[PDB]
Amino acid sequence: KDWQAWLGSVEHSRNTANASYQDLNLKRAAVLQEQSWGARGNAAIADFVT
């Protein structure tokens, strides 16, 4: 029983990190996309003024 419980905990200890790894990148990609879109919009105004 004790080693079975130990293995059960070990399984979730991996599942949780495997789950979190995807969501972190999901947030980062959106942040970078927003920043890149702002940077793309700055140059349009620069060229319009020039």
CA atoms within 13 A on the CB side of 22: 4
Residues in contact with a copy of itself, total (CB under 8 A)? 6
* Contact positions with a copy of itself (CB under 8 A) in 31-50: 47, 50
- CA atoms of 29 and 23, how far apart (whole Å): 10
Min CB(16)–a copy of itself separation in Å: 6
CA atoms within 13 A on the CB side of 16: 6
25 binds a copy of itself (CB under 8 A): no
* Residues forming the site for a copy of itself (CB under 8 A): 12-13, 16, 20, 47, 50
